[PDB]
Amino acid sequence: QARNYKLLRAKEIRNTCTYCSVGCGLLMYSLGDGAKNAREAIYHIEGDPDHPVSRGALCPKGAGLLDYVNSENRLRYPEY
Amino acid sequence: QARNYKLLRAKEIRNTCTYCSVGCGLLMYSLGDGAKNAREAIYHIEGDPDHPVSRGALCPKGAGLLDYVNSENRLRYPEYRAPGSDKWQRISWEEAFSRIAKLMKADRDANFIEKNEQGVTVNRWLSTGMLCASGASNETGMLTQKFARSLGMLAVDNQARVXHGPTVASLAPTFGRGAMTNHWVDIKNANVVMVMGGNAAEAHPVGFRWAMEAKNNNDATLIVVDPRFTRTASVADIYAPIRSGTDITFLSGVLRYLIENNKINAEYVKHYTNASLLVRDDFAFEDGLFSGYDAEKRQYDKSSWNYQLDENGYAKRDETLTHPRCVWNLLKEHVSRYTPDVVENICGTPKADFLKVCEVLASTSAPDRTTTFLYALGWTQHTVGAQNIRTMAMIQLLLGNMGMAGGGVNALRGHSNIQGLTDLGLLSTSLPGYLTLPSEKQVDLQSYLEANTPKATLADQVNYWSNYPKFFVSLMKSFYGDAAQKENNWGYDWLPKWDQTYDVIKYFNMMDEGKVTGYFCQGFNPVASFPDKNKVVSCLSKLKYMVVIDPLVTETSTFWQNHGESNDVDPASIQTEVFRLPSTCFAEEDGSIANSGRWLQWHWKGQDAPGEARNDGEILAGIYHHLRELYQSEGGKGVEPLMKMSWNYKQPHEPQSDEVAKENNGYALEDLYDANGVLIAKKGQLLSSFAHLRDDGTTASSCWIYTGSWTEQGNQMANRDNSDPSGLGNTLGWAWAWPLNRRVLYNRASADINGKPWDPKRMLIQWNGSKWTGNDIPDFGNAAPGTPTGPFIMQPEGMGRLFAINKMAEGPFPEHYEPIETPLGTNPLHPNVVSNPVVRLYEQDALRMGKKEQFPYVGTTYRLTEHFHTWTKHALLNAIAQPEQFVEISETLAAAKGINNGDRVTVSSKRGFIRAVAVVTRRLKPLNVNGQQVETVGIPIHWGFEGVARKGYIANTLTPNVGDANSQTPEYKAFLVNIEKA
Amino acid sequence: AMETQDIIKRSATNSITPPSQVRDYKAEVAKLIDVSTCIGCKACQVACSEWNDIRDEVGHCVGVYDNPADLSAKSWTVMRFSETEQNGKLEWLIRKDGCMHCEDPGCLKACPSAGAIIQYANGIVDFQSENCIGCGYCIAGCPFNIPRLNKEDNRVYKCTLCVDRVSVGQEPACVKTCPTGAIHFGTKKEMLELAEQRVAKLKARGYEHAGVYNPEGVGGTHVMYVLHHADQPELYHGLPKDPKIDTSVSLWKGALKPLAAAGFIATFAGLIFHYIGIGPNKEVDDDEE
Amino acid sequence: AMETQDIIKRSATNSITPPSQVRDYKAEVAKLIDVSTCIGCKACQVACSEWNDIRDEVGHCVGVYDNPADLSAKSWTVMRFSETEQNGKLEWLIRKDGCMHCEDPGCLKACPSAGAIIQYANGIVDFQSENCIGCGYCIAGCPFNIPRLNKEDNRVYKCTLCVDRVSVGQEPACVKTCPTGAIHFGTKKEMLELAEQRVAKLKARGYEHAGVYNPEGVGGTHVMYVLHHADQPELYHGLPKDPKIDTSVSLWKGALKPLAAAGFIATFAGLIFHYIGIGPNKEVDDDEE
Ligand SMILES: Nc1nc2c(c(=O)[nH]1)N[C@H]1C(S)=C(S)[C@@H](COP(=O)(O)OP(=O)(O)OC[C@H]3O[C@@H](n4cnc5c(=O)[nH]c(N)nc54)[C@H](O)[C@@H]3O)O[C@H]1N2
Ligand SMILES: Nc1nc2c(c(=O)[nH]1)N[C@H]1C(S)=C(S)[C@@H](COP(=O)(O)OP(=O)(O)OC[C@H]3O[C@@H](n4cnc5c(=O)[nH]c(N)nc54)[C@H](O)[C@@H]3O)O[C@H]1N2
Ligand code: SF4
Numbered sequence A: 001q002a003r004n005y006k007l008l009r010a011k012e013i014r015n016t017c018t019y020c021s022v023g024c025g026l027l028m029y030s031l032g033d034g035a036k037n038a039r040e041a042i043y044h045i046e047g048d049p050d051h052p053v054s055r056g057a058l059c060p061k062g063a064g065l066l067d068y069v070n071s072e073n074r075l076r077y078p079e080y
Numbered sequence B: 001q002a003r004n005y006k007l008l009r010a011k012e013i014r015n016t017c018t019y020c021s022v023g024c025g026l027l028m029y030s031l032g033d034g035a036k037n038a039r040e041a042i043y044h045i046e047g048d049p050d051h052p053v054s055r056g057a058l059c060p061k062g063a064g065l066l067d068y069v070n071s072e073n074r075l076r077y078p079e080y081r082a083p084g085s086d087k088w089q090r091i092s093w094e095e096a097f098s099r100i101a102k103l104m105k106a107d108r109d110a111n112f113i114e115k116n117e118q119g120v121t122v123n124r125w126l127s128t129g130m131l132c133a134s135g136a137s138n139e140t141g142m143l144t145q146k147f148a149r150s151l152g153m154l155a156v157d158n159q160a161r162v163x164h165g166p167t168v169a170s171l172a173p174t175f176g177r178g179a180m181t182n183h184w185v186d187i188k189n190a191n192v193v194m195v196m197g198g199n200a201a202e203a204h205p206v207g208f209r210w211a212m213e214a215k216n217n218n219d220a221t222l223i224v225v226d227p228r229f230t231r232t233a234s235v236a237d238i239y240a241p242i243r244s245g246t247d248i249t250f251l252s253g254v255l256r257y258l259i260e261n262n263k264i265n266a267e268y269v270k271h272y273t274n275a276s277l278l279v280r281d282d283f284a285f286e287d288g289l290f291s292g293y294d295a296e297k298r299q300y301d302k303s304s305w306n307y308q309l310d311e312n313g314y315a316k317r318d319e320t321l322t323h324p325r326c327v328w329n330l331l332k333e334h335v336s337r338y339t340p341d342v343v344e345n346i347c348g349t350p351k352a353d354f355l356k357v358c359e360v361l362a363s364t365s366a367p368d369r370t371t372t373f374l375y376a377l378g379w380t381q382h383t384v385g386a387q388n389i390r391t392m393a394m395i396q397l398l399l400g401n402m403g404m405a406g407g408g409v410n411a412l413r414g415h416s417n418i419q420g421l422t423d424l425g426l427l428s429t430s431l432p433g434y435l436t437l438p439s440e441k442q443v444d445l446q447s448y449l450e451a452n453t454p455k456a457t458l459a460d461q462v463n464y465w466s467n468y469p470k471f472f473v474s475l476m477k478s479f480y481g482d483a484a485q486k487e488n489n490w491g492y493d494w495l496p497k498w499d500q501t502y503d504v505i506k507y508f509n510m511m512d513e514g515k516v517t518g519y520f521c522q523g524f525n526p527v528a529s530f531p532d533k534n535k536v537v538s539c540l541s542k543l544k545y546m547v548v549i550d551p552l553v554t555e556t557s558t559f560w561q562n563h564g565e566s567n568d569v570d571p572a573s574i575q576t577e578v579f580r581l582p583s584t585c586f587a588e589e590d591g592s593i594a595n596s597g598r599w600l601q602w603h604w605k606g607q608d609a610p611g612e613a614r615n616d617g618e619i620l621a622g623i624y625h626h627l628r629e630l631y632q633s634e635g636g637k638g639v640e641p642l643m644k645m646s647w648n649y650k651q652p653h654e655p656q657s658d659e660v661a662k663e664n665n666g667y668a669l670e671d672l673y674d675a676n677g678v679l680i681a682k683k684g685q686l687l688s689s690f691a692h693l694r695d696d697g698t699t700a701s702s703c704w705i706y707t708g709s710w711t712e713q714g715n716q717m718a719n720r721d722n723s724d725p726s727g728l729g730n731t732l733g734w735a736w737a738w739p740l741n742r743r744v745l746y747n748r749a750s751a752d753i754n755g756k757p758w759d760p761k762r763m764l765i766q767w768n769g770s771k772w773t774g775n776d777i778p779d780f781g782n783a784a785p786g787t788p789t790g791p792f793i794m795q796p797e798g799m800g801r802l803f804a805i806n807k808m809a810e811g812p813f814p815e816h817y818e819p820i821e822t823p824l825g826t827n828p829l830h831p832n833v834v835s836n837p838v839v840r841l842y843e844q845d846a847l848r849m850g851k852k853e854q855f856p857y858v859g860t861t862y863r864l865t866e867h868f869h870t871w872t873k874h875a876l877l878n879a880i881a882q883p884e885q886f887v888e889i890s891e892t893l894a895a896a897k898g899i900n901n902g903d904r905v906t907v908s909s910k911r912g913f914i915r916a917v918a919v920v921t922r923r924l925k926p927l928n929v930n931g932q933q934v935e936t937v938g939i940p941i942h943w944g945f946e947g948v949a950r951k952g953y954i955a956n957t958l959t960p961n962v963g964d965a966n967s968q969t970p971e972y973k974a975f976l977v978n979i980e981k982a
Numbered sequence C, D: 001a002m003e004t005q006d007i008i009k010r011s012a013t014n015s016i017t018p019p020s021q022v023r024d025y026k027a028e029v030a031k032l033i034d035v036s037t038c039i040g041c042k043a044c045q046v047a048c049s050e051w052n053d054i055r056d057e058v059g060h061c062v063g064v065y066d067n068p069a070d071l072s073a074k075s076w077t078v079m080r081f082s083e084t085e086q087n088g089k090l091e092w093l094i095r096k097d098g099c100m101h102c103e104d105p106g107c108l109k110a111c112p113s114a115g116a117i118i119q120y121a122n123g124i125v126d127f128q129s130e131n132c133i134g135c136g137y138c139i140a141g142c143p144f145n146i147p148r149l150n151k152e153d154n155r156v157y158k159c160t161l162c163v164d165r166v167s168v169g170q171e172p173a174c175v176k177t178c179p180t181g182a183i184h185f186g187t188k189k190e191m192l193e194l195a196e197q198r199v200a201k202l203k204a205r206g207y208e209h210a211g212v213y214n215p216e217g218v219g220g221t222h223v224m225y226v227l228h229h230a231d232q233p234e235l236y237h238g239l240p241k242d243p244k245i246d247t248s249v250s251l252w253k254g255a256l257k258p259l260a261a262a263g264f265i266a267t268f269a270g271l272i273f274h275y276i277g278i279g280p281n282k283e284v285d286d287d288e289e
């Protein structure tokens, strides 16, 4: 049968798209249930169906947020 | 490993079962997470484990809801059948609305009656009528009420007419209200559960769990008295047979037994019933007739059926109960004739069985033991239906079981919302909140209010109906708003005034005479449900137009179509224009419905309806706005009453459920103050209690008993707190019950005159020195223990009536009368008066009645657990459960006719025939009655000519067109038939 | 297969190569059907088919309430009705029928296809269809006549004890739906407790032979009954008295196999050593000298 | 395999041994892509790859907005752009491309490996990779040129209609994400209804040949389109007009097999009966007498 649904026990967090002013609602999913010993890591993001403006939709920018959050070019340390 | 759990990411929606009145909670699952791009589709439904009544359970009907919601027979598009045509033609919604409005306006302009012959404005329309949907929400109900009355319609009925009308007609006069007195879970507190005049294990299965809880875990005795050994009998401690139509004899025999053995709660009787009141000396009964009979009009002059009056105008009393004219002594005399031998001779019930029942019931005369009665159609569907119920209610008063947890009268309602539609008044002469439309003799507001506001008949009583004016004026403010003012008597003359009651049998008699032009069938299938189907089809064929609103294909919508023996008509000869409009079902709208225990429960939408189906309010609005616009530009008759009705919704073409529910609850139209100058409510706010309604135009409510359902604190019908602090099964935090959340009616009677509980382990209310408090909301005011104030607060005398004064059509005490079609051809108690002397029987119907020489067996109709009327046969799961039509007969009758189990047979009556498979069983046995052997042929009512189960015949092809003398509810439960091998 | 690593029995699998079962520390579960509280509503039939995505045909009425008339590939549970006067008065005995989830399943014992039938540590016996060859041996091996072949795919199907619900923590669909609570579910240990409490109550009402149906002949079952007349289970539409795997099936699937194995090996040895020992039988072994 | 017991078609499986499919009472689902409401944003490409855990290479621009330029093992859906003046004025026709989930799939029909391709009762056609041998027959069998081989594991991949989401009650990722609602999802019955309503609106705007693309040649599809110009599907970057399984493929996978089977059996019989009938052809059959 099909692979299991990958978000079944992930932590779900509400947020807003970071790009344009439409303000689409997001539902972000992190590995870990919030316990102190688990360092949360977002591994999937999709739309919030209840948001009145976006109603679950996300354009290619909002839909690809995972690759920005986890970009290889994220800054890690103060540099001089 | 196992297949993955199929609902893990589905949208979960809470709703309520759409079939019977138990009101089981549902959890529906839809494909899609609610995103706008995903069109939700329900693909699974199961129970809600937190619901206090169902606790996750669902019977085969509720469990198979998916197959109804997704039935292949769901309606998708507006369809039209032309005069003489044999096919449907799809049309647009706008075409349907315009065509219907045009037909309605032409008919209303031609036949509207502005004034009657005595010069009184009556504004009534009688040539077009409506049947209303008891399976639809309360909000749809109110919109229908406004639609119908603003147009002046009086031929407006819902299923109550053919169902529990007799209950309202008997329980209201006896206790003050016509509703089920306790609630489902409360049944678990009973010591004796009596199932007579009903078959709860098949008709209300999930609710019946609580009777099984009483039996299995409260050591209760379960008794079943029925002509058939049913599935309820399967689990009963005691089963006793009875001939259909003889309940009054059996129950009157119980009354005689209790009185003779002094098995009564004496203090309860002395104080809480009218046992001590004195009856006029001219009241009498002899040889089957009470005093005042007018043999030519076949009605009674009820002047003598009243109390003697004292010097202050109140009923005279004799607290010692020794006066020959006290109700108690007259009751004793009346039932003295019903000995065990008489019961055996008329009912067929063996004396040994009857004794067992008497003894067990008698054991509950003790203050700390109770019997609860669970009944429905076995008692209501008779020409003496209301009197059947009167007798049982009297028994509960003698035993002191009213107002008690585990006691009361649980008159189990039918349709999921028949309670709501009755509450909202979708009955010929009714208005919401058990108010009444003006009769044409009441020429002004003053006369109208005086006729409907009862004067107290004993001093120091609550007599709450004295508040009638506040409820009426508030209703008018809700209907008309600013147009209703003191100056024009709150719009009084805009309401249609009645000259008589336009019940369904009467209206179809009119239809047969060509007096009816059009008819609306909203969630009602008369071709299947009305008596004498062959006559019904003949009547409908005379209509010029018919509008059907339903989520499914119904036999009524296709009455013009030939279906062989099942419906042998010639389409070319029927000129009726038929409109079939596709509506939503329960799962496709939000709204509320009232269950049997008076619980108004909210439910939520799970998916959009299929195709172009629209919600009921949208359909009414489409027709209504098209029609009113025609009047705006053309003028016509009865323009003002139609145009003044309010339709104050943000989107007039799409009224929302919350808007209507709030109207029903009510609003303060000006700031309101109590007598001490304290603000009770601000202008514009929702009211919290009907106690705040006023008769001066400052308050509005379209259903006063619903005030408190949606307040400033929110939608109480959506409450989901299942806490039961007392352990008695009372959950005040789940949904909201009327009136004012009181779960057990008459609960002041759960305690004695000093306020002490009859059973300390079942305290419902108690006195704290200044007010009544407890495990239930007191159905009482603040009268201290020891005062004369009675516990039945809607009664002018504050008592339960053993003697029903002038309220019943055929007598203040019940009396045995045989069914119109009786297997005996006589009445053993009084041969001079065989059947009810006040029954109405039209000449045309009298000609269609059969006699025992040609139709020797008792015919009776009833339900099977697996199907709901002729509705579930459209759902595959239920069709699989009971696929083919059958009838039940005894081994004795089968042997006499040469019928082997499973053989095909033809059952017939004077009116028609059906053919079916024979289920031969010992569960049906002949009874010895008045020297004869009486056989019963049982006919389940679930098959017909539309659906996915095997095609069959409408059971009503067999039934007589005659009903209860009070409500005109058909005698579907006792008639005559013959049977032959087929 | 074996992803759950709690398979305690597997069809057609040699005893010396047992199935993966390290995760076997789990409580056994059980369904308890108290027929004395059953009202024959058939809600269980409907809930089962709805949940399991199956629909049988619209049948016929042949004189009884029973319908469908028998279990089938599309009806995994059916209510069976019996009217009797054998105990002194008319009684309508109604019993829910379907897989008993035997501790020692005859279906699994008779099955010739490796992995077609398995038993989980919690007591559920289930069919793994990918391995079913449609031989029907399980129908005869079953003491309760439960397995049913689907003509459309040549495979057997039956009640799975809602393994897809139980595996993730939820009770079966029929259990939840039962209007009167005639059907109970939980750990077998506590269901046995509830059964004995119910039997005590029935005895107090006059049913001196009330009892729990949990047949020792098949090692106990994970679907049990509380019966008013446990001394006469046949009254409930043929429920077997003292059921057990048939002796012919036990011999066929048991001793016959190794016996045949020994014969084969011994025969091969004999013939081989015979040829070698004596040599061929040709026309002339004499003029070879 | 077959855990869901609702497999209505399975590749390289003899017709007399059908796959497990007792749980087949389920409504067919469908995705409806209304190209007249599509804005060519590519959100669907992004949502698909994000959800499915796949990433194609960073390609090149060769003069058009299209990118990636074609479906691949790492791009299960791609937007295809077409500029035309064929209808009287400049139009930019944009179409989402990917598996059509055909009712009668050519990929499954051409596949030679048992169980490598299956069709679920709800209409989803999916690849069971454990059985894929990388032959590529499905690429030619597909009327829409959809399957794509992954060089890293020799297996084909394509749009799964988000079987992992749909199986548990949620709509596909691309469906949910579509900014303008050009993509709809639900039961096929109601999607057909929405499609006809949309076609009516387009006709009212002047598109007299607007229509639904649900090709009868492949038995209908579970991914359908609403097209402004249904009379000219080629305008939408080559969408086939009246697609069907190729005649050569139908013959190859059809009649050729049993014909060859008969020849083989008949040949074996002939040769065997021939040898026996006439006997060997040795140097001297004459001095044997
Ligand atoms: N399964 C199912 N449930 C239902 C419905 C349904 O269609 N199917 N409909 C719902 C509705 S609308 C309602 S009103 C209720 C009614 O529910 P009930 O009235 O309990 O049910 P019925 O099956 O009509 O029959 C009542 C019983 O009375 C017996 N009976 C017949 N004549 C007499 C008589 O004269 N005296 C006595 N004492 N018994 C008699 C019949 O054999 C039958 O078993 O059911 C509701 N619940
Ligand atoms: N022989 C005999 N006759 C009887 C009886 C009997 O015991 N025996 N019992 C009588 C009784 S008590 C009753 S209640 C009647 C019932 O008989 P009816 O109420 O006429 O019959 P139902 O089949 O329940 O159908 C009513 C309709 O409601 C439709 N409906 C569902 N939801 C909605 C909705 O939201 N909106 C609209 N507009 N429609 C909706 C259903 O699809 C159905 O077509 O039968 C009565 N007639
Ligand atoms: S998802 Fe797209 S439209 Fe929405 S806020 Fe982000 S960039 Fe804007």
Ligand code: SF4
Pocket (backbone or CB within 6 Å): B017, B018, B019, B020, B021, B022, B023, B024, B057, B058, B059, B060, B061, B062, B063, B204, B205, B206, B207
């Ligand atoms: S029909 Fe009645 S008893 Fe059955 S599930 Fe629906 S509400 Fe409950």
Ligand code: SF4
Pocket (backbone or CB within 6 Å): C033, C037, C038, C039, C040, C041, C042, C043, C044, C045, C079, C096, C177, C178, C179, C180, C181, C182, C183
């Ligand atoms: S659901 Fe329960 S009460 Fe109903 S038939 Fe099945 S076991 Fe009996």
Ligand code: SF4
Pocket (backbone or CB within 6 Å): C098, C099, C100, C101, C102, C105, C106, C107, C108, C125, C141, C142, C143, C144, C145, C146, C147, C158
């Ligand atoms: S009842 Fe039959 S099918 Fe079920 S586990 Fe037992 S032997 Fe196997």
Ligand code: SF4
Pocket (backbone or CB within 6 Å): C011, C110, C111, C112, C113, C116, C117, C127, C131, C132, C133, C134, C135, C136, C137, C138, C139, C147, C155, C156
């Ligand atoms: S039919 Fe039964 S015995 Fe045969 S392989 Fe399938 S499960 Fe095993």
Ligand code: SF4
Pocket (backbone or CB within 6 Å): C047, C048, C049, C051, C076, C077, C098, C158, C159, C160, C161, C162, C163, C172, C173, C174, C175
């Ligand atoms: S346990 Fe599940 S599979 Fe078995 S009868 Fe009940 S609902 Fe059906």
Ligand code: SF4
Pocket (backbone or CB within 6 Å): D033, D037, D038, D039, D040, D041, D042, D043, D044, D045, D079, D096, D177, D178, D179, D180, D181, D182, D183
């Ligand atoms: S997400 Fe929707 S609008 Fe955007 S390119 Fe894909 S189908 Fe077109």
Ligand code: SF4
Pocket (backbone or CB within 6 Å): D098, D099, D100, D101, D102, D105, D106, D107, D108, D125, D141, D142, D143, D144, D145, D146, D147, D158
């Ligand atoms: S589009 Fe091609 S890959 Fe997709 S289902 Fe159809 S034939 Fe198979």
Ligand code: SF4
Pocket (backbone or CB within 6 Å): D011, D110, D111, D112, D113, D116, D117, D127, D131, D132, D133, D134, D135, D136, D137, D138, D139, D147, D155, D156
């Ligand atoms: S490449 Fe295609 S045709 Fe070849 S085995 Fe894989 S799925 Fe089948």
Ligand code: SF4
Pocket (backbone or CB within 6 Å): D047, D048, D049, D051, D076, D077, D098, D158, D159, D160, D161, D162, D163, D172, D173, D174, D175
């Ligand atoms: S349905 Fe799922 S697999 Fe197919 S294109 Fe959309 S997101 Fe990708």
Ligand SMILES: [Mo+6]
Pocket (backbone or CB within 6 Å): B159, B162, B163, B164, B413, B414, B415, B418
């Ligand atoms: Mo009813």
